[PDB]
């Protein structure tokens, strides 16, 4: 796996954002996590998660995307990646805060599954947000 | 944020101590500050800060811990908190004396950041210890 540059266009919610990738606007969805819903007819913590992600990506010097080993886009045409803001994985950051659950683990896009799972466990142990 | 009871087990240095929290021994590290080093291969004021903290927590009737809004432990498994000795925040007391600098401000655990920064400013104006 390798990290590639991208440019933030717009934060959408906790786990979705619009990025400029290779000179094309693309919706990206975070691999291996689910932040709570705020669009589809609002879950508890859905708003917080969004704010968190929005802040984390807006404030970054650099945004990078890292595809996994399998599919790079979902059925909705969303890029599927691990996305890093100045080197800190957004996917992990959310989970570590109890603002996301590890979810949608579709092989073979599961390289960071164990890392994320352990962040989840700590968050759960610390009774943070979703786990509170 | 809410204050929770704990029991002193041992003062370690200026910004680290061992407490009994919910019936288990844990190392705790003070949020938002850094006292000078005395362990890792001895900075100026390190010994002074240790003594201050040790005195403040040993003489207390009650010790309380106050977690902030995010992570409750660091990578070393140390609890991250605002610690209060008879209602007095140890973190602030140190800063107020110029025995610690405000440091390691890692969002979102930054609730008392401003209060501490003001204490620091006064300690600096007064040319205390580290700022002397
Ligand atoms: C994270 C992820 C989501 N998805 C799909 C699964 C869900 O589709 P369905 O809605 O049709 O079940 C949806 C979850 O995304 P959201 O959490 O953005 O809704 O996106 C993937 O196909 N692969 C992925 O890796
Ligand atoms: C105060 C604090 C320290 N730490 C870490 C940062 C430093 O890690 P590194 O040692 O890996 O740089 C270390 C500083 O504490 P000390 O002053 O006890 O060294 O503890 C946190 O991760 N979060 C915190 O809130
Ligand atoms: Ca979601
Ligand atoms: Ca220190």
**Bridge partners for B5 per DSSP:** B64
* Cα–Cα distance for residue pair A72/B28, rounded to 1 Å: 43
Q: Does residue B34 have its Cβ closer than 6 Å to ligand 2?
A: yes
- Tokens representing residue B67 in the block: 């977690």
* Cα–Cα distance for residue pair B126/B15, rounded to 1 Å: 22
- Tokens representing residue B76 in the block: 């070393």
Pairwise CB contact (< 8 Å): A97 & B70: yes
Pairwise CB contact (< 8 Å): B72 & A96: no
The ranges assigned to domains in chain B are 1-132
Which residue minimizes the CA distance to atom 6 of ligand 1?
A104
Active site residue B72: no
| CATH topology classification for B1-132 | OB fold (Dihydrolipoamide Acetyltransferase, E2P) (2.40.50)
Testing ligand 1's pocket by substitution, the residue of A30, A74, A113 carrying the most ligand atoms inside 8 A of its CB is A74
Q: Which residues surround ligand 3, an ion (CB under 5 A)?
A: A 15, 34-35
Peptide bond connecting A108 to the previous residue in cis, omega within 30 degrees of 0: yes
How far from B112 is each of A90, A122, A126, B32, B35, CA to CA, in Å? Answer: 25, 24, 20, 8, 17
| CA proximity to B98, closest of B128, B118, B53 | B128
């Amino acid at each position: 796996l390798h990290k590639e540059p991208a440019t933030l266009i717009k934060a959408i919610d906790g786990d979705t954002m619009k990025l400029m990738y290779k000179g094309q606007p693309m919706t990206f969805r975070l691999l291996l996590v689910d932040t709570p819903e705020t669009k589809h007819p609002v879950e508890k913590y859905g708003p917080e998660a969004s704010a968190f992600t929005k802040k984390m990506v807006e404030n970054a010097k650099k945004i990078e995307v890292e595809f996994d080993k399998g599919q790079r886009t979902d059925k909705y045409g969303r890029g599927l990646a691990y996305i890093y803001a100045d080197g800190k994985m957004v996917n992990e950051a959310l989970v570590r805060q109890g603002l996301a659950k590890v979810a949608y683990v579709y092989k073979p896009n599961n390289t960071h599954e164990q890392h994320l799972r352990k962040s989840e466990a700590q968050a759960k142990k610390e009774k943070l947000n979703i786990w509170s």
